[PDB]
Amino acid sequence: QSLRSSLLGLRQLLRELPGDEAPLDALAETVLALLAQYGSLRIAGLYRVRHDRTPEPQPLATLGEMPVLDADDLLVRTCLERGELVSVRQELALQVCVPLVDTDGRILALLAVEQMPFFVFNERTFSLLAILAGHIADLLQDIDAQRFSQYLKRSLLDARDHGLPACLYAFELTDARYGEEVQRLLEGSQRGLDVQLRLRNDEGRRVLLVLLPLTSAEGSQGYLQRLRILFAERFGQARELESLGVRIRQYELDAGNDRQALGHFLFNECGLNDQQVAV
Ligand SMILES: Nc1nc2c(ncn2[C@@H]2O[C@@H]3COP(=O)(O)O[C@H]4[C@@H](O)[C@H](n5cnc6c(=O)[nH]c(N)nc65)O[C@@H]4COP(=O)(O)O[C@H]3[C@H]2O)c(=O)[nH]1
Ligand SMILES: Nc1nc2c(ncn2[C@@H]2O[C@@H]3COP(=O)(O)O[C@H]4[C@@H](O)[C@H](n5cnc6c(=O)[nH]c(N)nc65)O[C@@H]4COP(=O)(O)O[C@H]3[C@H]2O)c(=O)[nH]1
Ligand code: NA
Ligand code: NA
Numbered sequence: 139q140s141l142r143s144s145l146l147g148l149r150q151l152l153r154e155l156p157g158d159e160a161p162l163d164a165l166a167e168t169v170l171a172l173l174a175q176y177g178s179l180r181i182a183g184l185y186r187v188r189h190d191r192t193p194e195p196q197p198l199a200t201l202g203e204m205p206v207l208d209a210d211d212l213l214v215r216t217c218l219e220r221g222e223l224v225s226v227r228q229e230l231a232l233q234v235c236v237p238l239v240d241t242d243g244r245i246l247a248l249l250a251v252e253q254m255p256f257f258v259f260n261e262r263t264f265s266l267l268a269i270l271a272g273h274i275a276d277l278l279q280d281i282d283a284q285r286f287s288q289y290l291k292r293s294l295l296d297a298r299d300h301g302l303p304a305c306l307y308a309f310e311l312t313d314a315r316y317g318e319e320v321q322r323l324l325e326g327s328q329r330g331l332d333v334q335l336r337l338r339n340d341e342g343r344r345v346l347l348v349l350l351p352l353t354s355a356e357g358s359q360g361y362l363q364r365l366r367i368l369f370a371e372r373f374g375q376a377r378e379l380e381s382l383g384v385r386i387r388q389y390e391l392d393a394g395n396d397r398q399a400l401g402h403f404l405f406n407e408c409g410l411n412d413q414q415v416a417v
Pocket of ligand 3: 310385386387408
């Protein structure tokens with residue numbers, strides 16, 4: 139949950155820097171700091187990874203007395219070949235390598251850990267570094283549609299690799315009298331990290347997709363409940379959201395879901411296509 143704030147705080151940093159510098163370079167220190175905090179790291183470095191999946195030897199940022207990086211170190215190479223976090227056998231001078239991998243499988247950067255306290259050298263920690271690293275990779279990377287598809291892929295990976303839930307709402311706006319105003323209300327209701335996408339379904343109707351990443355069934359209930367109150371303010375208490383021609387479809391992503399089940403929701407049920415949302 140501290141996760142929300144960190145990502146949100148980073149996203150803000152991204153949005154408020156000049157083009158006169160690539161994000162990874164400007165935010166190297168911040169990114170390392172985030173990772174250092176979540177893994178209670180003591181000695182580590184952050185490195186750019188090249189298109190050819192080899193790291194730039196010169197670190198973007200370091201923490202403590204980080205040694206020169208050995209690019210031929212098997213741990214680095216195994217991490218970079220697999221695109222996955224790798225750690226040394228706990229029974230047995232890097233201790234862990236964590237790649238920053240975006241949703242397309244491109245590796246942007248490498249966290250190399252020389253030392254972390256023995257007692258945070260476990261799967262729960264590794265999981266957290268890996269979750270955070272993937273999200274960070276995303277942020278470093280049609281605007282609205284591209285972003286929506288990326289975040290959606292991220293959520294699929296998070297549910298699949300880590301069992302983290304997410305929720306997808308589709309708001310079909312069937313009464314043109316209120317369509318624009320309903321959308322405006324939803325857009326103004328937006329939490330950072332949540333993403334929205336305006337579309338037209340195959341029946342020619344306006345649809346507003348809302349993706350709530352990292353959000354449990356209870357969270358999605360809290361959200362919708364917050365919305366009904368906003369709606370009651372905007373169109374009066376006497377009026378229900380549905381009486382404004384709004385139809386709700388909801389899809390919970392979780393460990394037991396699949397890309398195929400999600401596609402069925404987007405295309406078969408919501409009536410969208412893969413030119414609108416990439417799965
Ligand atoms: N009632 C409610 N409204 C929500 C919720 N999530 C988003 N919103 C609404 O969406 C706006 C933006 O949220 P944010 O982008 O995540 O950005 C937020 C967030 O960065 C931060 N913030 C405020 N309260 C909290 C909080 O209880 N926890 C965390 N982690 N951050 C908060 O302040 C920013 C703006 O806060 P707001 O001015 O209130 O403005 C909020 C609020 O109007 C929610 O769970 N409940
Ligand atoms: N993904 C997503 N989830 C949402 C949204 N709105 C509500 N939820 C979920 O519903 C729970 C309770 O919402 P809340 O009643 O507004 O109760 C909120 C609200 O009162 C307050 N809060 C958090 N963030 C903000 C904010 O940015 N602005 C304001 N005004 N209040 C916030 O803290 C309470 C708890 O926040 P949470 O622990 O995060 O728990 C939230 C959250 O899991 C949303 O726009 N997006
Ligand atoms: Na519908
Ligand atoms: Na299609």
